[PDB]
């Protein structure tokens, strides 16, 4: 299954280097800028790579919803995470001409009783989400737990 698509050559190369180091089989889709990898490893690998910093309405909505769902699924592969919800809020093509807008994301996680996300895991989530959405800076990702505690500084 596709690990990543639409990668820069630089990111692609970095991702391939990491996969080789981890001894994970991979197949870079020919001229598809995509890297199909073991289906059962896709989510774990996305997270791991994120930790190392790598890399119509209905459709949009659907797309957005699909993206949200995928991101949630990936985040749920983290050990301490029981469930995750991702909400993406990219304003519709800035109607206002002068004012400038920017995409943001809100991530809510339900943690396993007695478990917490560490700083690394938190950073991985933030990176994963930011990388998935064009123009979404890490700073515009808010990560909260079930109790509403802000995890992202």
């Amino acid at each position: 299954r596709t690990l990543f698509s639409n990668l820069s050559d630089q990111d692609g190369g970095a991702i391939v280097a990491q996969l080789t180091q981890m001894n994970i089989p991979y197949r870079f889709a020919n001229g598809s800028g995509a890297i199909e990898v073991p289906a059962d490893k896709v989510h774990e690998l996305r997270l791991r790579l994120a930790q190392q910093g790598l890399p119509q309405f209905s459709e949009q909505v659907n797309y957005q919803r699909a993206l949200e769902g995928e991101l949630a699924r990936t985040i749920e592969t983290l050990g301490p995470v029981k469930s995750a919800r991702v909400h993406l809020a990219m304003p519709k093509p800035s109607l206002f001409v002068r004012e400038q807008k920017s995409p943001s994301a809100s991530v809510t996680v339900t943690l396993e009783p007695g478990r917490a996300l560490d700083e690394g895991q938190i950073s991985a989530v933030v990176h994963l989400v930011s990388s998935a959405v064009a123009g979404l800076p890490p700073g515009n990702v808010t990560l909260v737990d079930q109790s509403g505690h802000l995890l992202t500084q």
Binding site: S147, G148, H149, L150
Partner: peptide, 27 residues
């Protein structure tokens, strides 16, 4: 410039007060 920094400071304070209220009002 500085006004935007002050406004962001106010927004963060308001958001944290909101979250503190929500935390106890949730259970």
């Amino acid at each position: 410039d500085l006004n935007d920094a002050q406004l962001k400071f106010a927004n963060d304070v308001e958001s944290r007060i909101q979250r503190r209220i929500e935390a106890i009002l949730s259970p």
